[model samples]
Target chain A: AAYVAYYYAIKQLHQKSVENIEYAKYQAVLQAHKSLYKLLRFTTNTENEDSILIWEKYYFRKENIRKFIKELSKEIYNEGCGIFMSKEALSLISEYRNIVYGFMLSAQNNPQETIRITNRESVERMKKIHQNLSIEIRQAINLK
Target chain B: AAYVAYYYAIKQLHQKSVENIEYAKYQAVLQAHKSLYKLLRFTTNTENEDSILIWEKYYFRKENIRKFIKELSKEIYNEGCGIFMSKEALSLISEYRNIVYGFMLSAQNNPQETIRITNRESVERMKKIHQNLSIEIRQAINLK
Candidate 1:
């Protein structure tokens, strides 16, 4: 989106006559700044999707997308850890992310709209972890 | 809270008498009615005695909490269905709430943060359920 906005201003700039006030240049530069903002917001978004495929009486969908995953996917081994974050903090969140991901995946497969739990325990840990993690994140967001 | 406000106004009203427009009564009634609003807003908070946790603990410690949970806790059972709802096309949310509660409870007991899986498949089903549910919730918030 920022790329499009940037080029749009650039396109307009070129159409301007020389000795212009560079108003279009202002828009172009702001768009470049906005590109980084857009990317980080995307990074924060927990949702990911690629494409959906459907055929008569059959269908397929894809998700779990992130802008950086393409580059990081090659590095993920025993877990999705990219080693780009603090160990304890990142570890808890990574686990939470995957937990939610699994849930999202299950919903896709179950056409009956019924949820069946196979393990009552794993889901349980998520709460404490969730409660525990929220403080850290909360502090980071509002802590200073 | 309201009752206190009632008496405050009563005391204020007595200070005024003949040739007075009953401004005291107007002021008293508004406070009495607005009292409940102040109380519920206090309840959504989640932050607690523990040290700050992560994932924006500061912010979340501040949401979805209140006295209503006293009533709500009784509703969740095998499914965490709790059966309380906004009576929208949102009845399905009534179910997903339970599955998560089961997960949260399990988390409370597990300290080592170790997880064993007998059924990744059951967990897998939860993600889609969550996504579908969140989208609906989002729409409700976003729509109006």
Candidate 2:
């Protein structure tokens, strides 16, 4: 009898919080991916030759991605929280962030040819990571 | 073996999301209560009571509470989502909002004697509602 009440309590309280956080995490992950793609396009765009403007936009998008990352980490990866993300999902996000770091390094060094290949390689590899990231998030959200 | 995969998938995806949303809903409920109490105190405080300022603060706090209520509804009580609030929790929140509505109505009529009794009755009743609300939210969040 008491066990039923306890079960109901858990179902009502703990379960609901988990769902909202998952939804928020899903939205945050999608937003981060969108910004990263925008930056990726910037790298490939040949017409935007103004280096100053390019760098400014680059920095802005990079920071925006970082802001989303911070939110995910704080809200989802929190150690004390029961809603912490899985290791696989966490690793995927870190790998995704590194690609952006590499792109920034290539840009800062001004390797035009190197940047093209770097951008190209990053796109191919990031796509794979992105796919995996989607799978992990979908798994987290139980979409799959 | 298939059952194991299914269980893990459910645990990994759905459970985590439920936890996060519960935490967020808990936070939102607390915030709404905080704003409501501030407005309550504002009604009771006689100091620095310029009619203009009183009305301004009243409107601001009332709107702020409403803003939180909107958030709670959209994010937590949303339909088509697996993690909706329980009916009891929903009803308590609605009742709480009604008390604020009554308070607003009383203020608009500008009956000085009515305002005091109205304010006094609201406080006493609201505290009871608040206790029930807390229990309901805690039940939702599984804190209790």
Candidate 3:
């Protein structure tokens, strides 16, 4: 219930704000998108190799994945006219969603122990993606 | 202490990012203000209409709202712009603050039962706002 209300509240705010915002400002958003995309690409490539460990160490940890998704969603949404969950953001969500689904399927087919192993591997893949992205974002923004 | 420390840490990070980030990106950040306004308006209207129950049943859960808002505040503070409080992401904090103030006002004029009712209403209002926005976003992003 709280989640629903909050989403509505936020959505309305975003809609109203968009009406008052200027179009020229979108240029900055586009630039941010470019940088974000570059970071995403870098992270994706890195995660592709060490897919297993990344899951157990990072992605499967509920807090870590949730935080990563939330931040990613916020950035993408903000880029889309002050909203969270823009088209680009949705694409990323889809990517992650598919991976999760695949993992679930694999787990269903395997024995309990194998399921656990595959689940861990699946999480590792996600973790790699998340870690690489985090690093890429920090590097791009020069966090250190 | 954690909140304060977290706040400072985020502030420094955002500061560093902003410095490296181009002026164009700053402008882009403002562009998101449009969406923020819309979200606020929708939430206000829903609360006024008292169409809160439906949201409670289907939309964003209350726990998530609290959690998200807390994180949102941290994210704003981390930006290091000093004007972190002015960030649109903190809208939830501001709204909840207002709700609590309103509840206090209601309690001052009414009995204990009334206070409970008022507080529950406030939560309901928040719930409606969350659910509506989540649905709207899901639709906007073409999510299933």
Candidate 4:
């Protein structure tokens, strides 16, 4: 009886640990997406207006965002170390990371060009990717 | 041996469940605090520029905040249903709630007066309360 109970206890513990890690991974992804969206909106002036005095604010803020993304990447990896993420979720992360990289690239290359038409295209693309990632994560969460 | 193992298993499960609820409550409060801070910043033009056209934006947004707070209150209560929060944490929540109530009241009573000096005092008060609440919650989390 003790042996059986021990086996079941260990199994239950493993299940709980996996559930915890999965939830943590989801949270990390959600935070990354939120920060990315906020940065995108700020750069696009979708949520905030730009004035000559505050024009440098976005430029200065991108550095903070880079740091945040780097830290969050670590968190995501740590949470997912022992667990399996759905392929779709992993693909979404890769796609989102690429878009953020593109965004950072453009901002760094041409600091004044965020308002350009090209940036609008990137914004729309990023928006759609974010929506897809959102849906993917939610579905994964609901499945468990 | 079986009885001892079973007792330990049940105790471990209870501890894990309590920890989960506590974490959930913290997350809910964090979200509430974030939304409040964002709304406060937007209304005060700390993060966003205002135009005559968007004057109605803040006015229109308060109702949404109210709805969010109401929902979060339900979440907070549910999470704390079985677990115990520190007295300091609960008091901080009460204080924070009162400030939000006051903020909502002022906005509802005099929508044009958000820019007034009185509002600045309230903003300062709220900011301090948020910081204290943040500290209290973090300390409680650490103690566990």
Identify the leading candidate in terms of TM-score: 4
Fnat per candidate: 0.00, 0.16, 0.00, 0.03
TM-score pick, better of 1 and 4:
4
RMSD, each candidate, Å?
Answer: 24.3, 17.4, 18.9, 13.3
Show model 3 residue runs off by greater than 4 Å.
A1-26, A38-88, A91-117, A120-144, B1-97, B102-120, B130-144
Give the lowest summed-lDDT range of ten residues in model 1 chain B.
B76-85
lDDT of 1 by residue, B11-114 (tens): 54333331132232233223322332232222222333321111241121211222223322322211112111123423443443344344445566554432
Give every candidate's TM-score on chain A. 0.34, 0.41, 0.33, 0.47
CAPRI tier of model 1: incorrect
**Every model's TM-score:** 0.23, 0.27, 0.32, 0.34
Q: Rank the candidates by DockQ, best first.
A: 4, 2, 3, 1
| TM-score attained by model 1 | 0.23
lDDT of 3 by residue, A17-113 (tens): 4433333334434456454563343234244422222333334322133334444444444434234324444444446645644554445544433
State the local distance difference test value for candidate 4.
0.47
lDDT of 2 by residue, A1-144 (tens): 466556645755676666666567755543333222222222222212121112322222232334444544544435222234467866776777677665565466453332333234655666677567654543443342
Candidate 2 ranges beyond 4 A from true positions: A1-83, A109-119, A141-144, B1-144
lDDT of every model, 2 decimals: 0.35, 0.45, 0.41, 0.47
Report the candidate with higher TM-score, 1 versus 2. Answer: 2
For model 4, how does the per-residue alpha-carbon lDDT over A113-132 read when each residue is reduced to its tens digit?
33333345655665576567
Residue A50, model 1, lDDT: 23
lDDT of 1 at B31: 38
